[PDB]
Design an enzyme around this catalytic site. Sequence first.
Site, PDB file in Angstrom:
ATOM      1  N   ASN A  67      -0.834 -38.506  31.029  1.00 50.12           N
ATOM      2  CA  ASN A  67       0.570 -38.188  31.275  1.00 50.12           C
ATOM      3  C   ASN A  67       0.870 -36.976  30.400  1.00 50.12           C
ATOM      4  O   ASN A  67       1.144 -37.101  29.204  1.00 50.12           O
ATOM      5  CB  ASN A  67       1.455 -39.378  30.887  1.00 50.12           C
ATOM      6  CG  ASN A  67       1.065 -40.660  31.626  1.00 50.12           C
ATOM      7  OD1 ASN A  67       1.283 -40.774  32.828  1.00 50.12           O
ATOM      8  ND2 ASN A  67       0.491 -41.629  30.908  1.00 50.12           N
ATOM      9  N   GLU A 115      -2.640 -50.485  40.357  1.00 52.97           N
ATOM     10  CA  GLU A 115      -2.777 -49.695  39.140  1.00 52.97           C
ATOM     11  C   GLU A 115      -4.082 -48.895  39.089  1.00 52.97           C
ATOM     12  O   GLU A 115      -4.073 -47.701  38.797  1.00 52.97           O
ATOM     13  CB  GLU A 115      -2.680 -50.578  37.881  1.00 52.97           C
ATOM     14  CG  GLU A 115      -1.276 -51.048  37.465  1.00 52.97           C
ATOM     15  CD  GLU A 115      -0.298 -49.922  37.097  1.00 52.97           C
ATOM     16  OE1 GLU A 115      -0.715 -48.766  36.898  1.00 52.97           O
ATOM     17  OE2 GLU A 115       0.917 -50.207  36.988  1.00 52.97           O
ATOM     18  N   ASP A 168      -3.133 -43.788  30.346  1.00 50.63           N
ATOM     19  CA  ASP A 168      -3.175 -45.142  30.872  1.00 50.63           C
ATOM     20  C   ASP A 168      -4.662 -45.478  30.955  1.00 50.63           C
ATOM     21  O   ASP A 168      -5.457 -44.676  31.451  1.00 50.63           O
ATOM     22  CB  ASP A 168      -2.521 -45.172  32.254  1.00 50.63           C
ATOM     23  CG  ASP A 168      -1.085 -44.717  32.215  1.00 50.63           C
ATOM     24  OD1 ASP A 168      -0.379 -45.098  31.266  1.00 50.63           O
ATOM     25  OD2 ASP A 168      -0.665 -43.954  33.103  1.00 50.63           O
ATOM     26  N   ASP A 194       4.305 -36.678  28.179  1.00 51.35           N
ATOM     27  CA  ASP A 194       4.522 -37.316  26.892  1.00 51.35           C
ATOM     28  C   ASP A 194       3.256 -37.484  26.070  1.00 51.35           C
ATOM     29  O   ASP A 194       3.265 -38.151  25.037  1.00 51.35           O
ATOM     30  CB  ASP A 194       5.262 -38.647  27.068  1.00 51.35           C
ATOM     31  CG  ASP A 194       4.342 -39.793  27.432  1.00 51.35           C
ATOM     32  OD1 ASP A 194       3.311 -39.576  28.103  1.00 51.35           O
ATOM     33  OD2 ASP A 194       4.639 -40.916  26.998  1.00 51.35           O
ATOM     34  N   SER A 235       0.457 -39.220  26.645  1.00 51.34           N
ATOM     35  CA  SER A 235      -0.122 -40.549  26.562  1.00 51.34           C
ATOM     36  C   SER A 235      -1.134 -40.682  27.698  1.00 51.34           C
ATOM     37  O   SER A 235      -1.232 -39.790  28.542  1.00 51.34           O
ATOM     38  CB  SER A 235       0.964 -41.637  26.640  1.00 51.34           C
ATOM     39  OG  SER A 235       1.504 -41.797  27.951  1.00 51.34           O
ATOM     40  N   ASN A 237      -0.807 -48.290  28.740  1.00 51.38           N
ATOM     41  CA  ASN A 237      -0.464 -47.043  28.049  1.00 51.38           C
ATOM     42  C   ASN A 237      -0.724 -46.945  26.542  1.00 51.38           C
ATOM     43  O   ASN A 237      -0.358 -47.829  25.768  1.00 51.38           O
ATOM     44  CB  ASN A 237       1.003 -46.714  28.337  1.00 51.38           C
ATOM     45  CG  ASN A 237       1.381 -45.303  27.932  1.00 51.38           C
ATOM     46  OD1 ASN A 237       1.942 -45.086  26.867  1.00 51.38           O
ATOM     47  ND2 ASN A 237       1.096 -44.345  28.799  1.00 51.38           N
TER      48      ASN A 237
END
Length: 130
Positions: free
Chosen positions: A46, A35, A53, A49, A51, A60
Amino acid sequence: KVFERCELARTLKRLGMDGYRGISLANWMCLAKWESGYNTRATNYNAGDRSTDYGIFQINSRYWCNDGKTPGAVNACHLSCSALLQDNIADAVACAKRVVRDPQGIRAWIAWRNRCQNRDVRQYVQGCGV
């Protein structure tokens, strides 16, 4: 902070992750590895959308933490996403636990499916004294 392998393994173990809801330490290590490369300051936007991380587990903003800039998002771990960017991982660990309490468990992270599921993850905890 960028953790070293065995340092993180022990840090996670002290925090109660070994076997949390049946998830081994080696699985959590494989997750953090893919990750963020064990980087607590890792972040990924992202665009699709809107968002982001955050942290070592790349949690998220849409459902787990609040950053105030993600549309119609919730905050299931009840934390500022900033809490997931600290060198100290206690809050990120509590949130990671919150995530796995859901039906999917560790599978919540698609990267875990791609690189850890049905894989030999022993190498992640070997020689760390855990």
